[PDB]
Amino acid sequence: QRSLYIPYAGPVLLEFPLLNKGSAFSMEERRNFNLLGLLPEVVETIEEQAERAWIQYQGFKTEIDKHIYLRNIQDTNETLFYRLVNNHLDEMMPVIYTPTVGAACERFSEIYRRSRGVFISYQNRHNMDDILQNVPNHNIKVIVVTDGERILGLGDQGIGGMGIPIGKLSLYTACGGISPAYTLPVVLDVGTNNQQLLNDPLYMGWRNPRITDDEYYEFVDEFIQAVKQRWPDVLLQFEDFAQKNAMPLLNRYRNEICSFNDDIQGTAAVTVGTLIAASRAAGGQLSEKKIVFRGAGSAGCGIAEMIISQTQREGLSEEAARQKVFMVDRFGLLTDKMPNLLPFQTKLVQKRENLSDWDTDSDVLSLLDVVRNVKPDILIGVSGCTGLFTEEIIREMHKHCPRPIVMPLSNPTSRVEATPQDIIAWTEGNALVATGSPFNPVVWKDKIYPIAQCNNAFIFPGIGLGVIASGASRITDEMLMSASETLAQYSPLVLNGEGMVLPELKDIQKVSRAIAFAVGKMAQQQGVAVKTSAEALQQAIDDNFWQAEYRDYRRTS
Numbered sequence: 001q002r003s004l005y006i007p008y009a010g011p012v013l014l015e016f017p018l019l020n021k022g023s024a025f026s027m028e029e030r031r032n033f034n035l036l037g038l039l040p041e042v043v044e045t046i047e048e049q050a051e052r053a054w055i056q057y058q059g060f061k062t063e064i065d066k067h068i069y070l071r072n073i074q075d076t077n078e079t080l081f082y083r084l085v086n087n088h089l090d091e092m093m094p095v096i097y098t099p100t101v102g103a104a105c106e107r108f109s110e111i112y113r114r115s116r117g118v119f120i121s122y123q124n125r126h127n128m129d130d131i132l133q134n135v136p137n138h139n140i141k142v143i144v145v146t147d148g149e150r151i152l153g154l155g156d157q158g159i160g161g162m163g164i165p166i167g168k169l170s171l172y173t174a175c176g177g178i179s180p181a182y183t184l185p186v187v188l189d190v191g192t193n194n195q196q197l198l199n200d201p202l203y204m205g206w207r208n209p210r211i212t213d214d215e216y217y218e219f220v221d222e223f224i225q226a227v228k229q230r231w232p233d234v235l236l237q238f239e240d241f242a243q244k245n246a247m248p249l250l251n252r253y254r255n256e257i258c259s260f261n262d263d264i265q266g267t268a269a270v271t272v273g274t275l276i277a278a279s280r281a282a283g284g285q286l287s288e289k290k291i292v293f294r295g296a297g298s299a300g301c302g303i304a305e306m307i308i309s310q311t312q313r314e315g316l317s318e319e320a321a322r323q324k325v326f327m328v329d330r331f332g333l334l335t336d337k338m339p340n341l342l343p344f345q346t347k348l349v350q351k352r353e354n355l356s357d358w359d360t361d362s363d364v365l366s367l368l369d370v371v372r373n374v375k376p377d378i379l380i381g382v383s384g385c386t387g388l389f390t391e392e393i394i395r396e397m398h399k400h401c402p403r404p405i406v407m408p409l410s411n412p413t414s415r416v417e418a419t420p421q422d423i424i425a426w427t428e429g430n431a432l433v434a435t436g437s438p439f440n441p442v443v444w445k446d447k448i449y450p451i452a453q454c455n456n457a458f459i460f461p462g463i464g465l466g467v468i469a470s471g472a473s474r475i476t477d478e479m480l481m482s483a484s485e486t487l488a489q490y491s492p493l494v495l496n497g498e499g500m501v502l503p504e505l506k507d508i509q510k511v512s513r514a515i516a517f518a519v520g521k522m523a524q525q526q527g528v529a530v531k532t533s534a535e536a537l538q539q540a541i542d543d544n545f546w547q548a549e550y551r552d553y554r555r556t557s
Contacts, residue, residue: 462515
């Protein structure tokens with residue numbers, strides 16, 4: 001790798017976190033960049049720096065303190081921060097990101113030390129070009145943007161949303177190899193309806209309720225246009241917007257700028273990937289299985305739609321695929337004759353003629369009565385109501401299905417329709433379990449059963465690395481499906497015949513690189529990236545994969 005040419009020197013250099021090498025600056029670099037005497041004499045390696053940093057990390061006693069310490073290192077030496085993270089991925093990922101980052105966002109205005117990222121408030125709405133011009137990076141390739149309205153089970157956190165993009169981009173870098181020189185976290189501050197923040201004397205954001213719908217969509221459009229002018233090929237990822245906004249924005253912009261929404265699209269993809277692999281481990285394939293959803297909101301229907309696309313890819317007709325899926329809201333079941341259904345749920349309603357077979361009747365047909373009459377292979381929970389997967393509901397399902405697949409996906413752990421410990425009991429260790437939130441490996445009869453988590457970090461970093469390596473101009477449904485299918489190929493339970501359904505975090509870089517290949521190939525096949533040989537695309541993936549090592553520096557004027 002060639003030298004990097006850099007204008008900064010002296011204490012400015014030591015204080016520029018992307019470029020600072022601290023004690024690893026060589027003797028020659030210390031001479032050329034006017035650093036002699038500003039540092040202790042010792043020249044150390046990054047691995048020696050990361051080892052001191054790990055010793056420091058271990059002296060902190062709470063999660064939030066570990067989080068602050070990691071952000072402090074990130075703000076001192078970015079390469080060192082990534083080296084340390086790579087050495088302790090399992091321990092730190094939950095400190096960098098969910099669930100600890102949520103606490104950080106709640107308390108943003110109290111724990112604030114310094115600024116990272118770009119803040120675009122309503123008052124700045126006519127100067128977004130000037131703001132983007134203030135970013136010093138020569139090139140930006142991935143932006144994560146939030147308005148902070150819906151943070152992971154905490155609601156509206158106003159400008160404190162910033163911690164989400166920052167954490168998310170650290171995962172792009174650590175998991176997908178996107179260089180931290182090419183990422184940019186952005187918060188849109190259009191107000192907050194959290195009255196406790198509006199009333200917090202320490203609040204650092206715009207002290208105003210959220211702007212109106214018309215005001216909002218004009219403001220976001222100025223933002224999208226400003227981002228396009230400066231970085232036309234950027235990948236823009238939307239994160240933690242309100243449900244009323246998340247889908248419309250995705251539809252409006254997914255063909256105008258290369259973009260996706262991880263909460264909608266990434267969550268569907270990792271879940272479908274898990275379902276593919278689970279079904280193969282239970283014997284057979286997802287197209288064979290019958291499926292009931294508890295939770296028929298926008299999120300449940302979006303995941304259902306992707307399962308249906310996938311089972312079509314496995315051999316079924318659309319009619320057949322949709323017939324194998326049953327969606328349950330508060331009331332018993334979505335069917336024909338149900339009044340006042342919004343367009344997306346209509347697509348999934350059951351027709352009563354197919355239900356002439358059923359033993360019960362009613363306007364309202366309970367979940368226990370749906371489970372009874374379908375006899376599913378897969379039960380999925382997305383509603384968020386606790387205990388709904390009652391012992392009777394589980395046994396009735398195990399009463400016909402030998403190797404049940406059950407997935408309480410509801411977040412956080414408090415809102416799960418059943419715990420892993422419960423359902424593994426109620427199925428005598430026959431069930432396959434994957435969760436939305438992390439659980440510890442379950443103990444049962446001296447036997448240990450690890451519980452896989454449908455973590456989005458299995459999907460988005462590969463997506464980003466694929467986009468950038470192929471130069472893809474948009475992110476198609478088919479590119480997302482290729483990510484799900486590729487992820488399933490790395491299932492340890494299927495590969496070795498034993499383990500979790502999803503792969504271990506030790507392998508997340510390997511998975512991301514494979515996903516990137518598939519996503520890139522799909523893009524080229526669909527005509528949203530230039531065609532190249534498979535060997536060339538692989539080489540691009542390798543050339544774009546940043547690892548935590550220092551570059552050599554040369555000084556310019």
